[PDB]
DNA sequence: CCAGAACGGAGCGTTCTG
DNA sequence: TCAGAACGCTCCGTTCTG
C-alpha cells in the first residue's frame, strides 16, 4: 500500500524533516529553508501541487511543506 | 516608457509581431518549436509579470498568442 | 533509515551578431 | 529594425555517500 508524499502526493520515500515526503520535496525544502525563500505565487496562493505541477509554484509548494510540519531539526 | 504586452517588463522592440521584451521573445520561440504542452497549477488565469512569468509557462504562452505573437511575423 | 552532497538535465534570460 | 545562436545561471530530481 504505497505511502504518499504529504506535500505533492508522489510516492513517499521515507520520513524527511519530520514528515512523510518524496525525495524531490525533501530536497526542495532543504533548498528553500537554506536559501532566501522570497517566492511569489502567480495565482491565489492555492496552486495545485502534484507531481506534474509542483515545479510550477515554489511559493505554494513551500507553504505546503510548512503546513505539513517540515522542519530541519527533526 | 514602452512595455511588453505579455509581462509589462521593459520592451526591447517588436518580436514575432508584438511589442515584447527579450525574455518573452525567446520564451515564445522555445514554446512553439518545442512541442511540450504546459499545465497551469491555478485557473488558467495567472498573473504574468517580471517575476511571476517564470511560474506558469501555460499562462505566459496563452498570453503571447492572445497578444498576436506569430512566427513568420 | 535519514540527511546532505553531487550530478546531469531543463529552462530562463542576457548578450552578441548580422 | 529583429531573429537567432549561445552561454551562464538557477532550479529540479535522482543517485551517492556518511
Ligand atoms: C533528468 As534526471 C532523471 O537526472 O532528474
Ligand atoms: Zn512530494
Ligand atoms: Zn501558487
Ligand atoms: Zn515580456
Ligand atoms: Zn497559470
Numbering used by the authors:
A (entry chain A): 417 to 490
B (entry chain B): 418 to 490
Authors' description from the paper:
The GR is a ligand-regulated transcription factor (TF) that controls the expression of thousands of genes. GR has a domain structure common to the NR superfamily: an unstructured N-terminal domain, a zinc finger (ZnF)-containing DNA-binding domain (DBD), a hinge region and a ligand-binding domain. To modulate transcription, GR binds directly to DNA at canonical GBSs composed of two pseudo-palindromic hexameric repeats separated by a 3-bp spacer (5′-AGAACAnnnTGTTCT-3′). GR binds a canonical GBS as a dimer oriented in a head-to-head fashion.
Next, we biochemically characterize the extant human GR (hereafter GR, unless labeled otherwise) DBD bound to an unmethylated CpG-containing GBS (pre-GBS) and its methylated counterpart (5mC-GBS) and find that GR has preference for the 5mCpG GBS over the pre-GBS. Binding to the 5mC-GBS and pre-GBS showed Kd values of 131 and 206 nM, respectively. To determine how GR recognizes the 5mC-GBS and pre-GBS, we solved crystal structures of the GR DBD–5mC-GBS and GR DBD–pre-GBS complexes at a resolution of 2.0 and 2.5 Å, respectively. Both complexes crystallized in the C 1 2 1 space group and each structure contains a dimer of DBD protein molecules in the asymmetric unit. We found that in the 5mC-GBS structure, Arg447 makes side-on hydrophobic contacts with the methyl group of the 5mC, mimicking interactions with a thymine base seen in extant GBSs. This hydrophobic interaction is lost in the GR DBD–pre-GBS complex that contains an unmodified cytosine base at this position. Without this interaction, Arg447 in monomer B moves outward but still makes hydrogen bonds with the guanine in CpG dinucleotide by one amide group, suggesting the methyl-derived side-on contact helps stabilize the Arg447. Each GR DBD monomer contacts the methylated pre-GBS with one more van der Waals contact than with an unmethylated pre-GBS, which results in larger buried solvent accessible surface area (BASA) between GR DBD and nucleotides in each half-palindromic site (140 Å2 versus 109 Å2 and 125 Å2 versus 115 Å2). The affinity between GR and pre-GBS (206 nM) suggests the pre-GBS may be a functional glucocorticoid response element (GRE) as it is a variation of TpG-containing GBS.
